[PDB]
Amino acid sequence: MQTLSERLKKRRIALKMTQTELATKAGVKQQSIQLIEAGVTKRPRFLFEIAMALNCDPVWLQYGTKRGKAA
């Protein structure tokens, strides 16, 4: 899926979670996250917040790739 909208959406499906739920946990509004999912907000400020809230990686929900913690 790769892109901001697609990859974020995928995980929200995989977790049986709704945007308001994600927004609340992430400390933001639903409309804020919809802007990513709708394909408008290609760089969110609250990106980190969404990531941990949705139990995934910033760079992944963004571009399709997960931070190589393992060197």
Curated annotation (Swiss-Prot):
Keywords: DNA-binding, Early protein, Repressor, Transcription, Transcription regulation. Residues 8-61 form the HTH cro/C1-type domain. GO terms for molecular function: DNA binding. The keyword Transcription regulation applies. InterPro entries: Cro-like (IPR000655), Cro/C1-type_HTH (IPR001387), Lambda_DNA-bd_dom_sf (IPR010982). GO terms for biological process: regulation of DNA-templated transcription. Residues 19-38 bind DNA. Disulfide bonds: none annotated. Cro represses genes normally expressed in early phage development and is necessary for the late stage of lytic growth. It does this by binding to the OL and OR operators regions normally used by the repressor protein for lysogenic maintenance. This is Regulatory protein cro. It comes from Enterobacteria phage 434. The gene is CRO.
